[PDB]
Paper text:
Rspo (R-spondin, also roof plate-specific spondin) proteins are evolutionarily conserved from fish to humans and have well-documented roles in a broad range of developmental and physiological processes resulting from enhancement of canonical and non-canonical Wnt signalling. ZNRF3/RNF43 specifically targets these Wnt receptors for ubiquitination and turnover, hence reducing Wnt signalling responses. Direct extracellular interaction with Rspo proteins inhibits ZNRF3/RNF43 activity.
The crystal structures of the ZNRF3ecto–Rspo2Fu1–Fu2 and RNF43ecto–Rspo2Fu1–Fu2 complexes revealed a 1:1 interaction between Fu1 of the Rspo2Fu1–Fu2 and a single ZNRF3ecto or RNF43ecto chain. The αC–β7 loop is a flexible region in the unliganded ZNRF3ecto crystal structures and moulds to interface the RspoFu1–Fu2 M68 in the complex. The acidic region of the β3–β4 loop (immediately adjacent to C104 of the disulphide bridge) becomes more ordered in the ligand-bound ZNRF3ecto structures, probably as a result of electrostatic interactions with a positively charged patch on Rspo Fu1. The overall assembly thus comprises a 2:2 complex of ZNRF3ecto–Rspo2Fu1–Fu2. Notably, the β1–β2 hairpin shows less conformational variation in the liganded ZNRF3ecto dimer structures, always maintaining a tight embrace, consistent with the Rspo2Fu1–Fu2 interactions contributing an indirect stabilizing effect on the dimer via the β3–β4 loop.
Residue numbers in the entry:
A (entry chain B), D (entry chain D): 39 to 142
B (entry chain A): 53 to 205
C (entry chain C): 54 to 205
The structure:
């Protein structure tokens, strides 16, 4: 059924979430149903709101997944991840890790 | 309110390339919030909170789609980001060749919709209820894809 | 029986707002198929690419609006199919409507109205003249367009 | 922009071919127009026909170029040839001559 759910409907999935959790509009093909989630999935990050807690679009350059508005986790291929930001080559005073997409 | 003949079209391909299709008809009415034009397109379910301005760059959908929106009992959201009109209008802005409101929970919307005659949108806006609503929603929750064809006769 | 065809260009923005160009034109609703309005993404077809001569042809997405430029019937002496045959095959193959350009083969309009005995579920339209030119132009130049045909 | 072509239209390209050549439909966006070719490209094969010569889709599982509807010339990489079909393993009724990429 619908999980993590305060108010709920068979058609739209979750309508209101338990307070700690985040509202996520998921597409399974034709349907888009509310979910009430602990962690947002790859490509998203959680946001606490007075209206409700909500999972937002990870809008940041060359970054597959992020923790915040502007802190990245996994960068897209060929980008080196240092200090929460994605970089083309590793920055001056920094060096790419062996066998890694991570600087120092 | 002219009557909206909504034909939901399920289809099969076969290895030979061809399609067979069969047809559920439902009935709704067109609002004055939108044209008395027929429409047809891929059906896409829009959650009610997923038509708002506030989202800056919402998800991208191929132009030419049919919104289907399941509205609830209005106290389930007392402070909506928009009116029914604002959502119908957003959808259309974002390519909906038409929008189908399932107003089963909230008959109030019919009224709200026809009060928006001042701006009547390019594209049609249909309201459906009752068993006709049931059919649509079950088509949505069960079927992989389907195709709506809204007719104004 | 008049066919009020709208051909619609669309491009998105970053916000997913759609700016649109819309061209209208006039055809007639041939009785070989239904008189009903219809909407779909345009797909041109070679009339020689519309033959039940291949047992396995490639799958198009259901719901398209076909456009077929007809050429002088001397250019194919013994066709793979009739005009009717070709239209029905577009519908069979997913076309939600078929738009014919009978400019170079206007007799077809008669061959088409032969089908008024056993009419197809979907619109089968004909255009010609300036209307056909306007249509073909868009097809030939643009990446995409969406046809809205109305029966009024 | 209209070659190999006996009959040539601005809207449909080639309508008939010079009779050495194979007929083909190019799908370029919404457009479908005819080309007259000497070679049917990869994915297709030529069938000298009574009306015209044409390219048909090679739909043999695991074959690149078809010799005929039911015979393969070139298997995909690492695919073993037999009855002019392709295999990941040479079936019964044929000992796989490895070096040659065939069965016997």
């Amino acid at each position: 059924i619908c999980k993590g759910c305060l108010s709920c409907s068979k058609d739209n999935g979750c309508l209101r979430c338990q307070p700690k959790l985040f509202f996520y509009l998921r597409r399974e093909g034709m349907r888009q149903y509310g979910e009430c989630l602990q962690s947002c999935p790859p490509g998203y990050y959680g946001v606490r709101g007075p209206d409700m807690n909500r999972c937002s679009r990870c809008r940041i350059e060359n970054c597959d997944s992020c923790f915040s508005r502007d802190f990245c986790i996994k960068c897209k291929s060929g980008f080196y991840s240092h200090k929460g930001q994605c970089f083309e080559e590793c920055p001056e005073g920094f060096a790419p890790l062996d066998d890694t997409m991570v600087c120092v | 309110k002219e009557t909206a003949f909504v034909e939901v079209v399920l289809f099969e391909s076969s290895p030979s390339g061809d399609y067979t299709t069969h047809t559920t008809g439902l009935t709704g009415r067109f609002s004055r919030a939108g044209a008395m034009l027929s429409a047809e397109g891929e059906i896409v379910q829009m959650h009610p909170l997923g038509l708002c301005n506030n989202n800056d760059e919402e998800d991208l959908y191929e132009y030419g789609w049919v919104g289907v929106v399941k509205l609830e009992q209005p106290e389930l959201d007392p402070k909506p980001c928009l009116t029914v009109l604002g959502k119908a209008k957003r959808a259309v802005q974002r390519g909906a060749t038409a929008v189908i409101f399932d107003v089963s929970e909230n008959p109030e919307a019919i009224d709200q919709l026809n009060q928006g005659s001042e701006d009547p949108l390019k594209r049609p806006v249909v309201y459906v209820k009752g068993a006709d609503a049931i059919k649509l929603m079950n088509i949505v929750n069960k079927q992989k894809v389907a195709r709506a064809r809204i007719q104004h006769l």
